[PDB]
Design a protein around this motif. Structure first.
Motif, PDB file in Angstrom:
ATOM      1  N   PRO A  57      20.189  37.954  38.679  1.00 40.90           N
ATOM      2  CA  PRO A  57      18.741  37.798  38.847  1.00 40.90           C
ATOM      3  C   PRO A  57      18.042  39.109  38.466  1.00 40.90           C
ATOM      4  CG  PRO A  57      19.951  37.104  40.812  1.00 40.90           C
ATOM      5  CD  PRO A  57      20.906  37.884  39.967  1.00 40.90           C
TER       6      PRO A  57
ATOM      7  N   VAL B  94      15.054  41.655  38.586  1.00 45.31           N
ATOM      8  CA  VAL B  94      13.955  42.085  39.455  1.00 45.31           C
ATOM      9  C   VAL B  94      13.747  43.562  39.208  1.00 45.31           C
ATOM     10  CG1 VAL B  94      12.994  42.214  41.801  1.00 45.31           C
ATOM     11  CG2 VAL B  94      14.741  40.486  41.295  1.00 45.31           C
TER      12      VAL B  94
ATOM     13  N   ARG C  62       9.879  39.490  38.775  1.00 43.48           N
ATOM     14  CA  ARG C  62      11.041  38.607  38.929  1.00 43.48           C
ATOM     15  C   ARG C  62      10.961  37.532  37.858  1.00 43.48           C
ATOM     16  NH1 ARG C  62       8.682  39.480  43.654  1.00 43.48           N
ATOM     17  NH2 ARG C  62       9.807  40.591  45.313  1.00 43.48           N
TER      18      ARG C  62
ATOM     19  N   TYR D 274       6.117  35.571  45.437  1.00 46.08           N
ATOM     20  CA  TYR D 274       6.346  36.407  44.243  1.00 46.08           C
ATOM     21  C   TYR D 274       5.192  36.325  43.235  1.00 46.08           C
ATOM     22  CZ  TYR D 274      11.177  35.917  46.154  1.00 46.08           C
ATOM     23  OH  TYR D 274      12.285  35.887  46.980  1.00 46.08           O
TER      24      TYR D 274
END
Ligand SMILES: NC(=O)c1ccc[n+]([C@@H]2O[C@H](COP(=O)([O-])OP(=O)(O)OC[C@H]3O[C@@H](n4cnc5c(N)ncnc54)[C@H](O)[C@@H]3O)[C@@H](O)[C@H]2O)c1
Ligand SMILES: NC(=O)c1ccc[n+]([C@@H]2O[C@H](COP(=O)([O-])OP(=O)(O)OC[C@H]3O[C@@H](n4cnc5c(N)ncnc54)[C@H](O)[C@@H]3O)[C@@H](O)[C@H]2O)c1
Ligand SMILES: NC(=O)c1ccc[n+]([C@@H]2O[C@H](COP(=O)([O-])OP(=O)(O)OC[C@H]3O[C@@H](n4cnc5c(N)ncnc54)[C@H](O)[C@@H]3O)[C@@H](O)[C@H]2O)c1
Ligand SMILES: NC(=O)c1ccc[n+]([C@@H]2O[C@H](COP(=O)([O-])OP(=O)(O)OC[C@H]3O[C@@H](n4cnc5c(N)ncnc54)[C@H](O)[C@@H]3O)[C@@H](O)[C@H]2O)c1
Lengths: 255, 255, 255, 255
Positions: free
Chosen positions: C124, C126, C140, C184
């Motif tokens: 992921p 970020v 993100r 987010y």
């Protein structure tokens, strides 16, 4: 009835699982993680996805519930005792969401609750998109995403896809960074396919692909075909109270 | 059987209509523009839309065919004599596409084959979007578009909407230039609604709206509500040969 | 003057290079691939990018020309003899495009003619986006792309970026599949930065990144910072005739 | 020095203006709404836009300040007394943002601080886009928007445009619902033009257009040309403290 509880593994989730287990002990209500009729996931959507993939062979026997410590939940920790009680009484109805079947031929078959995506092994990504045997486009870009209706709020959304109500038995294809110029052309729009439509991806160069199915991501070598269809199998949720999909969407995205 | 032919009104379309009328004269096959069972449109999609709206009260009695001089056609001019012959023999099957119902309350009801859109009378556009009685978002922007599945290739597409196969009974809502900041929030994604879901637009300031239904655009004053639902009525096409929707999409957008 | 010619390596490009070398032999006009003043690339934009990266240490000494067998060309094969002659006479003016500096700290510095992108090692993705020391957003998503003005037609475009005229000394940041929900938040828009603005990417989890610079893609481990700025260095092209950037864009994307 | 204060006209803004006037009375510091050197706007960006258009003939003589009761402010009501004092001492520096010139020929010239847009009179919108005399595209769609750098956060953003730092002397063209198919083609990307590039819109059918310049929207009849260029004139702001554009963007869009 038989049940199990998965946990995210942090201190909050484990403790909440233990307390629920004790609450279920007061009823009965056997704990069984081999052949449960009810699967409770305590954590986030990742935990819920792991729970689903843990029991994807007994989908027609299980109803899923999620507690959010969170799109697929459902429940907050402080409501957990209410849940134990309602679950105990069987005061619930079942809701079914459609799933996506992915077939990879070199056959490996996968079920997705959210999406299945394809990217190169790195790698310019180029595939022919074939819909019910008709050559639709040659896709050049970063990759493609095929989403279920409940997956439309996830990776699909990030890619410009539509949110679809899960009472619609469909799958939706989105582009990742498609190249469009005088020579190269894609549709440049998401596509929504009904049940019994088959979308096939065929290699042009390059037969190695990084294929994702929800959280799982694996490199596949020597691929002849990637085939998408809405699955005959469904996921069942236990509910409990009205929590409409559009309300769930509002709560996750608006406020 | 009874039939009529509408034309775009240019020299090519009129002459082609006259020749078809003569061709149908050799069979019989009465021309009747009051109560036809078959409506042939010669022109573009505008002509086809006019044809549909001309007979929207007898939709359950009519099958439509389009000749393209063109998304809703079907046929090229040079094939017109083949069409006359096949139509004459009745060598065809019927395909049904879903339609959109628009209700405007101050009730006026409209049917759309493509889409129904809403903009201000000029006018900052601000409405509350209510889905099955739940307040989903307050939309601020230029306007909104609600499309049928066959409309998804039209105005919907231009607005970032998904293309939906018309075997799916649905409607799709797209944003026109939505404002999103720290204070103002929309979903920022198209939304796909099943049959029997109701989407209602409610005024915030400002009760005057410019409302479109396909080609028709009229200013409505003192509006209390705009209500969208997938219609119970369908449009029927005559076909004739395989021309799959995705092939039609390929031909119109790829090559 | 000193010159060299790179080739794509197919039969057409090599043969065209040999014929040009012979044409230059009639003038003089020394071939030198160590310290050339003129670099001719025969192939596509990939070939041109390789040519640029081959001589990125002598950018202030070289003027580049491209032959397209193609955004960075310039010339068709059949015009090659005209080019030899004009180049021979020195009948040309110099045009400069701005470049992007990438700094990776664990310092490694890279120059991009097109773009520099960042993705996770899978992963992921970020990162915190810091602009001139101010914390702007926590990104993100799948990754980020930072493009020069001439790169805006490439990967940038595919990601929804604006096309910028290369007389503007700037760099442009685009998102790859950003996640936006109630929790987010990203800006959800491309950002255009002037010269002397510094954009820094700082890891949140996860300090391993797949970093691209044009064609080059390498995994970087234990990263503390990725820093973007418009470079002090420029690429020089030889021209020859009017071929405006917007005309070049028209030709590549419209017709 | 000479100053004036515009107000939104609600009770909060008027009262705040009166109190500031009294505060300025303690210095001196003449109020003059004919030929002010300082223009204070109390309200929102609409108020600020009205203030700018009220004095667009004396832009080179005025510095603007905004109080937000708000992208172009600057100041909160509770800080107003600090502002009076700092303004009184002349403890400020001047920042200049570029503006857009719109010329409409049938010549009418307009200045925009935010954007100038074009739509039909209703009306399919079709224009030829000409860049420095080169025919770039035939645009079909809902309309076009040309934005200054400070306008990029407004209507531009809603249309998928890039945010540009206002130290860049440029204008940016965005599409409104462009139609793209096999026959009709636009670039499908925002375009960023430097100072001294001229973008001209030329009618195809249809010579009547609804033209906006910030808040002002008027129907123009019998148009031959709409011409865009970055203006030679600039807007000056008074500042006071560091409030970087990217921080301003963060505050308005992230949190
Ligand atoms: N750019 C992107 O949107 C992006 C990139 C990669 C993966 N993903 C998503 O991550 C999922 C699985 O990854 P993971 O959970 O193991 O870790 P992860 O961090 O990659 O994804 C988890 C995040 O996605 C959210 N999420 C999961 N399902 C959702 C749904 N249906 N609707 C809205 N949000 C949802 C979760 O709440 C969480 O915030 C994949 O199924 C994919 O949908 C998204
Ligand atoms: N920006 C836009 O996409 C835009 C703006 C206004 C109207 N429209 C469309 O125009 C239609 C009716 O207008 P009109 O025909 O009287 O004149 P028009 O010029 O405004 O629209 C006709 C154009 O749209 C195409 N079209 C119509 N239906 C289509 C379909 N379902 N799929 C793909 N293309 C289609 C036609 O082939 C033609 O090129 C509306 O139903 C709306 O969909 C589109
Ligand atoms: N989805 C995408 O747009 C995507 C994905 C990966 C890489 N790329 C691009 O590929 C470039 C380098 O890769 P490669 O050439 O070695 O192989 P490649 O196949 O990945 O890219 C080459 C293609 O991009 C085009 N291209 C290169 N520079 C361009 C420019 N400035 N404007 C318009 N088109 C341009 C080429 O003509 C060719 O069609 C990178 O600089 C990046 O811009 C694009
Ligand atoms: N869909 C859209 O984004 C849309 C549609 C029409 C007009 N507008 C904008 O409205 C402006 C003028 O209208 P009005 O103020 O008289 O009433 P309005 O309601 O139409 O616009 C005001 C809104 O836009 C915001 N705004 C104005 N300038 C901005 C800037 N540069 N950056 C970020 N936000 C900004 C204001 O804070 C306010 O929220 C126009 O200049 C245009 O930019 C936007």
């Amino acid at each position: 009835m038989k049940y199990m509880i998965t946990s995210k593994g942090d201190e909050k989730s484990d403790l909440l699982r233990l307390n629920m287990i004790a609450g279920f002990g007061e009823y009965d209500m056997e704990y069984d993680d081999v052949e449960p009729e009810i699967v409770i996931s305590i954590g986030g959507d990742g935990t819920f996805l792991s729970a689903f993939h843990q029991y994807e062979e007994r989908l027609d026997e299980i109803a899923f519930i999620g507690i959010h410590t969170g799109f697929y939940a459902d429940w907050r920790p402080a409501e957990a005792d209410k849940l134990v009680k309602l679950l105990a009484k069987g005061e619930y109805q079942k809701v079914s969401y459609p799933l996506l079947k992915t077939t990879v031929k070199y056959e490996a078959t996968y079920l997705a609750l959210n999406e299945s995506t394809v990217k190169s092994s790195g790698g310019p990504f180029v595939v022919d998109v074939v819909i019910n045997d008709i050559h639709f486009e040659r896709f050049r870009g970063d990759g493609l995403c095929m989403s279920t209706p409940s997956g439309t709020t996830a990776y699909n959304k990030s890619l410009g896809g539509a949110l679809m109500h899960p009472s619609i038995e469909a799958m939706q294809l989105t582009e990742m960074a498609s190249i469009n110029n005088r020579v190269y052309r894609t549709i440049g729009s998401p596509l929504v396919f009904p049940k019994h439509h088959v979308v096939s991806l065929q290699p042009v160069n390059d037969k190695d692909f990084q294929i994702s199915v929800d959280h799982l991501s694996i490199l596949h070598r020597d691929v002849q075909e990637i085939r998408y269809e809405v699955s005959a199998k469904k996921i069942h949720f236990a509910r409990f109270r009205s929590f409409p999909f559009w309300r769930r969407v509002h709560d996750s995205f608006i406020e």
